[PDB]
């Protein structure tokens, strides 16, 4: 325990293994330590470390934070096998600047800390507004189809779908920089909605199961096609494909023959339960030497995040549709929802990613809250709401308290 | 001997260890100095730390 071995990082990237005194204060070692790395660099034939103007030599963690000069290496949380970085930090001292006249003073100062609008951002705003505009247009046209079977909805939406996709193609080919790509992607993605309702609205007669088969089908196809030729925005497109696919299976079954919705909902729930365990494998198979490894790593990470999101959306819709405050053993789905939530609530810890872990943890909480709301709207009476309100506030309070306390 | 003698005057315990081995001078990285060569042969000058 009298000494510790650690890796020290030096100029341009050489790592050197050294056995340091575990109890002397850190300020005592930086100078001779610098000599040793320079000696090895000089014998190795590399360029030694050098000072520049005014500054000092400091020893920091790989995060960059310097260690307190007066404390012992054992007094700090540094263990054998860790690594450190030796660095030069320049002097920041300079004269102070004053401006008397408050009008000029406020103008000069305020222009430094905040960013003004520019022509690059101006385009992304317009691009976002056009996307919002068409998703509203499809909404009113779709609402009209719900009361009328005439071709108008498909006729007018079809032309919009063609126009938005046409414009998107030119932007994609003309692109030059990351900013240009962002604008192009936002525009193309906006084409999926008008095209989707354009097909689903074509089959005559009242709306329902028969039209549903077309809608979720063309939707899944378009999302997959965009992902293939674009190869960007992986996570969101992946989510659309999953939710679209599972809905198409349910739509086709209900359209062909189904004894009850409960049967379909129960089937979907079981499919999702097994899908959670397959998700990491699916994500993993879906994916100068350094480029291949990092590309593989980030591509893989993205697919899992999207895959988890798709499953989370389906279970809450299915689960909340299965439970009921009046039908039979009212308590059976309530406790079943609890057991189903427990698995998700506990398993979230197995993944290192922050957003992946948070989405899993969040998926369980929303189901419990949603179930209570359903049981509060229907079977409405002072006892029902009084119980639900107390439950909803105590529920998360206990969860955070158990973790923080 | 003089270091242990001085340590006792400071009230600190003398240098002591157990097991097969030996006592020697080392650099900040733990590398021991050469036992058969002069400090003038090695790169040692006034104010160095060991």
């Amino acid at each position: 325990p009298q000494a510790v071995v650690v890796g020290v990082m030096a100029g341009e990237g050489v790592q050197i293994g050294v056995l340091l005194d575990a109890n002397a204060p850190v300020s005592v070692m930086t100078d001779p330590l610098l000599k040793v790395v320079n000696s090895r660099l000089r014998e190795l034939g590399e360029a030694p470390l050098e000072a520049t103007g005014r500054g000092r030599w400091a020893l920091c963690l790989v995060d960059g934070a310097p260690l307190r000069a007066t404390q012992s290496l054992t007094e700090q949380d540094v263990y054998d096998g860790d690594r450190l970085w030796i660095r030069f930090i320049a002097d920041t001292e300079r004269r102070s600047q004053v401006i008397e006249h408050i009008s000029t003073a406020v103008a000069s100062d305020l222009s430094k800390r905040f960013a003004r609008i520019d022509p690059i951002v101006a385009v992304q705003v317009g691009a976002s507004m056009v996307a919002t505009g068409v998703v509203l247009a499809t909404g009113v046209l779709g609402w009209w189809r719900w009361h009328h079977n005439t071709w108008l909805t498909t006729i007018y939406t079809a032309v919009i779908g063609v126009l938005v996709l046409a414009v998107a193609m030119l932007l994609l080919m003309r692109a030059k920089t990351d900013a240009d790509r962002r604008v192009a992607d936002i525009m193309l993605m906006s084409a999926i909605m008008p095209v989707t309702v354009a097909a689903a609205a074509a089959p005559p007669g009242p709306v329902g199961s028969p039209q549903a088969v077309l809608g979720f089908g063309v939707l899944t196809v378009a999302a997959a096609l965009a992902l293939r030729f674009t190869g960007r925005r992986l996570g969101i497109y992946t989510t659309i494909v999953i939710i679209g696919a599972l809905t198409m299976l349910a739509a086709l079954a209900r359209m062909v023959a189904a004894t009850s919705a409960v049967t379909l909902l129960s089937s979907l729930l079981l499919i999702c339960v097994v899908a959670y365990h397959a998700a990491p494998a699916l994500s993993r198979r879906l994916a100068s030497s350094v480029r291949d490894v990092l590309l593989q790593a980030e591509r893989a990470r993205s697919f899992l995040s999207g895959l988890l999101t798709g499953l989370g959306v389906m279970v809450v819709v299915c689960m909340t549709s299965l439970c009921d405050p009046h039908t039979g053993q009212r308590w059976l789905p309530l406790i079943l929802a609890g057991f189903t939530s427990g698995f998700l609530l506990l398993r979230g810890r197995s993944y290192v990613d922050r957003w992946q872990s948070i989405t899993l943890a969040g998926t369980a909480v929303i189901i419990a809250a949603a179930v209570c709301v359903r049981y509060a709207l229907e079977l409405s009476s002072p006892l029902a709401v009084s119980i639900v309100a107390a439950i909803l506030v105590l529920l998360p309070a206990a969860g955070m308290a158990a973790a923080a306390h | 001997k003089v270091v242990n003698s001085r340590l006792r005057e400071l009230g600190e315990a003398p240098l002591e260890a157990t097991g097969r081995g030996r006592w020697a001078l080392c650099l900040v990285d733990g590398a021991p100095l050469r036992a058969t060569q002069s400090l003038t042969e090695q790169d040692v000058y006034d104010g160095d730390r060991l």
């Binding site: 300020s27 | 006034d46 104010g47 730390r49």
Partner: peptide, 18 residues
Amino acid sequence: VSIAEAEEFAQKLAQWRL
């Protein structure tokens, strides 16, 4: 400056001569 800082600087300076 502290006593430690003074001796640290003094040791660095002690290495050189005309």
